[PDB]
From a paper:
Mammalian excitatory amino acid transporters (EAATs) are responsible for clearing the neurotransmitter glutamate from the synaptic cleft.
We determined a crystal structure of GltTk in complex with D-aspartate at 2.8 Å resolution. Comparison of the GltTk structures in complex with L- and D-aspartate revealed a highly similar binding mode of the substrates with analogous orientation of amino and carboxyl groups. Despite the impossibility to superimpose two enantiomers, D- and L-aspartate are capable of forming almost identical hydrogen bonding networks with conserved amino acid residues of the substrate-binding site. There are only small changes in the positions of the Cα atoms and Cβ carboxyl groups due to the constitutional differences. However, this divergence leads to only minor changes in the interaction network, consistent with the comparable Kd and ΔH values determined by ITC. Three peaks of electron density located at the same positions as three sodium ions in the GltTk complex with L-aspartate most probably correspond to sodium ions, consistent with a 3:1 Na+: D-aspartate coupling stoichiometry.
Numbering used by the authors:
A (entry chain A): 12 to 122, 127 to 431
B (entry chain C): 3 to 122, 129 to 430
C (entry chain B): 17 to 122, 131 to 430
The structure:
């Protein structure tokens, strides 16, 4: 059965299974007897994340010039900010069509300390990479791996045979590791149809029943807005750089479906990278840098979930956001999506920062704190679709930057 | 550059047996004569150094040997080796509880404690998922062996795949990586050998401290617990291990003389995981087993195959249940076999975890450790002599790991018969 | 240029702390010093592990063993001299005699065993240098043994492994040099922040402590280091000129362990020591060889007892020499840890830090200027590591005599 089209079978069936079990009251059998298999699928991808990030980027940063890496960053970051900003802008319009939370009708009454930005930045530079590796801190690994692979290529270009042979040997240890990791990613993706089925079956069972109210109308709204981001911003950007966007989606889909049901960008980095190499044809000089960075700081789906649910609260308490306030949201939902860790649920946690920025404080027991908790009740329903666009923008950004740097192997894009 | 240097000249297997016998005589003297606090202060640190040294080697020598060994074998074999070692571990655990129950009733442990007592899916799955690590750098830093065993097996297998490629580039990268582990494994096994120079001293100290602290306590019905447990541990070795060993054509007397360094070390460190470096170096040099086997069976067995604990748990549960005037019926002892096997599989390879898990074995037959009850009193009588019993069991926990590794090896033709001829 | 940022930042921070903009300096200049510290920090664990595995293979145990026996004997004697200087310099300045406070008239072994790691992957993640030092020696010693095997097969495995450490060390030393491009800025920021916050406080008998502590630190360099250096035939003006990057990085980061990458690259590029030496003596000395701490402790211990009217007797000052040496060995190589350990030196002559007591006030006067004293302290903590590594290296002929000629 076509493995491009079989992981898609597990997604649908688990969704029907979980919706059916959820609508019929067996979600506790699904948590006990089905949830563990998706958890196994999650643990397997998780173990690959730290080595496959470290090794691919040491290799990739050696296997390219600094000035390219530097131009890749400036390019990928210019793309990343603007695709995030467009996501906020799309959620705001999609939130109004669906008219989210206007019928929740809570009275509220007429109404900062922004987190230090510098310490988050200094936090990029690790102070012990063995610790950042053991703690799982991807962004500090990205920094050390680039710094390291850059130094390895410098040492490969030295007059000594003794120095060249030591540095070149080190780089082979990383190349040996990276090639081994991409191998297992492909092997675990044999189980991927099952883990997908279990995760979506557990999720649909627990919060299926909850997608029935104006929360259901929220879900309708968030998924619609995510879609526009793809078919408008990604397809147009993809088609703009001469990439058949249908060939792009057809290649991304393994990374999209694991992103969806694991609700973790960082947890689906291995599939996103293996998709970026085998299917997409990107060179490690590119995706070994952009794909892990984007798993953290490029969350188009979160920046749009945050845009849609922020309108839901202000409507739900009778203090709708003015225009001048929605323009603060574009700034601050981008900032919060940059800050959102790539693990399940962290986007809701960061949504608070976005409210605190427009003057909707979450004082406990207040009407605002009530609307926030209506959202967190369907968070997994919205979490799946959110992480998917967080990854898809990482691939569309990697593929687009690659065709710009001549680092895209066009032999992989031929319907024959 | 010191003043004095004279040690290190004797058969280390014979001198490690010298430190064990002498330390037991020494600690017993401080016990009945009251210098047990000098031994904890002035002798225990040497046994502690010997433990830290073996401890530093565990994570590299498991990771490297199993990456090496797992690349150096075919998966369809590895899967059959696992199936073989796993069925052996279960049957021998079941056999140990079966022996502890029989040896426990023969010695009749705790039948005369005379405490009055009033006549009055969910949990295992996460333990399995937890075998799969979610970050191996962390599982390494945290010391999580079973997650590393998993990663190491999974890794080396991928390395052999890459060594078989049309590319000269992929083959040589994998081939290079594989050398780093092989380089690491050989360096670890080297240091194991250097450290085992200190082992006659470290063995002497550990047994001297334990015998000093808990010697005095082995005088009462706890002494009869000791009598039962050692008798069963002895029976488990000379009956089930010897009969099992001889059935597959291994001289059981040759096994013990090769195992002894691991046996004596497991005994005095009371930690399977802590005697793994000696257990593997013994599996290679003395036993003649190939890294394709013991790099998997020896770390897997240090955790999940505890024959010595599974017999300890059978004897002490009979001791407690007899001690409250509600002796165990047969139908319960068949639950003890079911549940002490389960609880011995769960017992971590650290000193004392068998008592901590012994509680789970009691909870399974209806002896709750509610505070102030008679039951909690008998459990604490056991925890009072746990070290005296901890030594003898970890010896049989490890002795059974070597016996299982060698027996599985000869069925896969992977044992070097040149060490067994003379 | 690292020496210009040090001068300019100190003049700058003194001015800002004098217009009350020390919180403007903490807000807008301290981060550059923190980047420079995080950058140097990331390198310590790899560049220590790799350099010592390499260096320990590339030398004989009996040398390493004799180097150790030599470096440890050097380490003790130079430390003991510092306290004797702090006692003399603290007594010369008569520190804290005008504080006039009335006072009432009437596990070590585990730290040793702690050197032996129990999981080296963990000791790596934790930043525990000394347990890595032990494992790296134990490892690298094993590699040459396997490279000195009859096998072609094992010779190539270990030779492969050793190259991984050599490849890593060479990248580490490379990055240290690149990070030192930023160092003129990071130095400026750190000294500007410290001068801003604690400048104002060098004004009282605290000023005389700063005067006293720095004066003795200088003698340790210009007397004991220079005399010992000249005794083994090393030009001290060429030495300091080579040491300076490690000195000034140690000065403004107040972390010996944080200056390890600069101290080692100075030991290789500038000094010319072989990894068989400095990859063992320099990380060992960052922890246990603190001349600068032992002199602070001698001067400030005199400061407390004078400030409370129970001056130390001779028999007591001779306990300070023993115990300020011991406390400097125990002081971690991070900012401030010498002050924390000064407490153990006070308790050693009977100045207990019972809360609210007169003793506890003099301690807190000292902790108010700790950073002003911490900078000068960590500088002589590494400066003594370089001087001894070079001196011990020349005794094992492992010093490159070509870098000391023009
Ligand atoms: C006890 C026996 C009960 C039998 C079933 C009765 C339960 C109520 C209807 C069930 O159908 C679901 O419930 C919501 C009904 O409101 C829909 O919400 C929503 O569904 C979309 C989003 O999923 C939104 O766009 C829609 O506006 C909104 O109707 C939802 O989709 C639909 O699947
Ligand atoms: N699901 C997480 C966080 C979120 O849901 O916002 C991610 O993008 O990786
Ligand atoms: N001694 C422990 C378990 C126990 O205490 O029984 C071991 O085998 O590692
Ligand atoms: N500054 C620290 C400790 C101290 O202040 O003494 C060091 O030298 O490493
Ligand atoms: Na974006
Ligand atoms: Na992303
Ligand atoms: Na983010
Ligand atoms: Na068993
Ligand atoms: Na065992
Ligand atoms: Na166990
Ligand atoms: Na010294
Ligand atoms: Na020092
Ligand atoms: Na110290």
């Amino acid at each position: 059965y076509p493995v491009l089209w079989k992981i898609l079978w597990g997604l649908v069936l688990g969704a029907v299974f979980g919706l059916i079990a959820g609508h019929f009251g067996y979600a506790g059998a699904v948590k006990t007897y089905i949830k563990p298999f998706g958890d196994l699928f999650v643990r397997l991808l998780k173990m690959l994340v730290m080595p496959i990030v470290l090794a691919s980027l040491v290799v990739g940063a050696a296997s390219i010039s600094p000035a390219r890496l530097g131009r890749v960053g400036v390019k990928i970051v210019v793309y990343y900010l603007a695709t995030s900003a467009m996501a906020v802008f799309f959620g705001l319009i999609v939130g109004r069509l669906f008219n989210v939370g206007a019928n929740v009708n809570l009275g509220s009454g007429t109404g900062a300390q922004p987190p230090s930005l510098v310490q988050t930045l200094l936090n990029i530079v690790p102070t012990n990479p063995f610790a950042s590796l053991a703690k799982g801190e991807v962004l500090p690994v990205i920094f050390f791996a680039i710094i390291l692979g850059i130094a390895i290529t410098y040492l490969m270009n030295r007059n000594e045979e003794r120095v060249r042979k030591s540095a070149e040997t080190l780089l082979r240890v990383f190349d040996g590791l990276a090639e081994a990791m991409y191998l297992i990613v492909g092997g675990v993706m044999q189980y991927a149809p099952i883990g997908v089925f279990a995760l979506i079956a557990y999720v649909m069972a627990e919060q299926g029943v909850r997608v029935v109210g104006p929360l259901a109308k929220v879900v309708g709204a968030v998924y619609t807005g995510l879609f526009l981001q793809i078919v408008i911003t990604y397809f147009i950007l993809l088609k703009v750089f001469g990439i058949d966007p249908i060939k792009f989606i057809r290649k991304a889909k393994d990374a999209m479906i694991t992103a969806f049901v694991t609700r973790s960008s960082s947890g689906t980095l291995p599939v996103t990278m293996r998709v970026a190499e085998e299917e997409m044809g990107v060179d490690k000089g590119i995706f070994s840098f952009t794909l892990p960075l984007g798993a953290t700081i490029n969350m188009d789906g979160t920046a749009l979930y945050q845009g849609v649910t922020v309108l839901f609260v202000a409507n739900a308490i009778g203090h709708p956001l003015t225009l001048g306030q929605q323009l603060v949201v574009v700034l601050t939902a981008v900032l919060a999506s940059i800050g959102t860790a790539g693990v399940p649920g962290a986007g809701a946690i960061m949504l608070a920062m976005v409210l605190q920025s427009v003057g909707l404080d979450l004082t406990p027991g207040s009407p605002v704190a009530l609307a926030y908790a209506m959202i967190l009740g369907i968070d997994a329903i919205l979490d799946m679709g959110r992480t998917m666009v967080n990854v898809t923008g990482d691939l569309a950004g990697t593929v687009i930057v690659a065709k710009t740097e001549k680092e895209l192997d066009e032999s992989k894009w031929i319907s024959h």
